[PDB]
């Protein structure tokens, strides 16, 4: 039974392994999207002038 | 061996020399005064002077 | 305006409106620009076409004597609008606004309580601070803040406190309520500068950081009133692998831009450390100032043109940007070090005075001494 | 968790450098725009003094 107690840890452990590993990414590419619509903004600006 | 060497002096002080006279008219050349116009705005600006 | 009724001839000589080409020829022969230049011909013949395509409401591509005068007589009213947009009147000198109270030292610095209206003085050398009226000069209270002289005196709003520091090592907090001292906190080092930051984001507390002479920022929160932490500087007893950030001189000034978040530090290194107030570590330190940098504003008139303005030692105001590390702008015209750069809030007008009793006010959209 | 480790990686790095362009794009705007503005003084300058 301590065993198994033991091995829960490792478990949850693991199970927080794969969810950080399953996360967003996507939130991250977001934020390059933003700024890279800024930069054509900018571009366009900078044309202009 | 020593004629040479001060051919090469002389190839070298000429070309420096050459080089020096540049630099002197680049120098009485930058009067332009900025931007953009440059002599004719103190040129209205010495009328003004005037 | 001489040949306003030749070009009227002209543009009537067509009888259904100038067309693209008579419309550019007529003001080519009618303006005082140069015709057989071909660059400003072309350039003017575009502007013209544009002006042209503008008039062009019908779409008939036909541009008649009539939509020219209403087009006239609308940049007319325009002109009338005697600023071109946000008409920046000159700060004419207050007529109905002078010192009354008997200061007896020299002014050493004043802080305008504008939550308060309580423009607290400190005087230098002297042992109290007398708040008066930022629209009246009207001192309220000769108060001594505390037992030597104040070097700075911000209002925490988070408790209704005027907080000052003095060079005795102690910060006093006086209910403006009562202008009674509602807290005494001790200090290791006297902070030479003393700012309320109430960051924008609502978890943040908000912190009066304090710059002394050591360049640590000291953090005291505006309900304890006491010191909790302390950002970056010039320590060398602190002898590590740690990357210099900070300043090597003084703290003068901190700038809570609660809109960036960012405490900006300026120091006599001339270094303008942006420290990220949510976790106080530097997110940039601006550089370009030949001294000293003593005074910091953030002019934020429009997003597509804010711009922090700093100044000190240099006699000329630096203009940056939080992206930009390069100053972006530098106002000109001024004879003595630059007390330093006020934006003023509601308005593009940036104020940059010298030591020498001359302001010159500025457009930020222009930055030219207005 | 070693497959998803094998997957997971990267994007802070595009950010930082996207938040870069953005900076750089804003300077020449600016630059530009300072340019356009010195030209644009001497256009009615130059019509007046014609």
Known sequence: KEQKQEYER?????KIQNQELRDKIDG?????????????????????? | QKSKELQELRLQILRLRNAYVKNQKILKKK???????????????????? | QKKMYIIEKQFDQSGKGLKIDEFVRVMLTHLDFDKSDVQKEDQITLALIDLFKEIDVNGDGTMEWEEFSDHIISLGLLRNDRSFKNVIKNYFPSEHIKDNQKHETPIEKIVYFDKLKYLVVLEKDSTRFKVYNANTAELYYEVNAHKCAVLDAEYIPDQNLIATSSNDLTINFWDSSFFIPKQIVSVPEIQLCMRYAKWSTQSQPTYLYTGGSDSIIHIYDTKTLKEKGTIGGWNPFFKRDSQQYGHASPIGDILPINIQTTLVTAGLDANICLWDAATHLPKKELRGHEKGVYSLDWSDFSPMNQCLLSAGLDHEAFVWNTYVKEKIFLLRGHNHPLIGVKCLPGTPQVITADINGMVKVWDVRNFLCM | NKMLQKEKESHAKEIDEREKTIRDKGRRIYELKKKTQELEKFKFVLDYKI
Do not use: S
């Open chain 1, 10 to 14: 490792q478990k949850e452990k693991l």
């Open chain 1, 28 to 49: 991250q590419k977001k934020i390059i999207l933003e700024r890279d619509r800024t930069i054509g903004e900018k571009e366009k600006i900078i044309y202009n002038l």
């Open chain 2, 31 to 50: 009067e332009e005064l900025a931007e953009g116009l440059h002599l004719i705005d103190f040129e209205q600006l010495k009328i003004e002077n005037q």
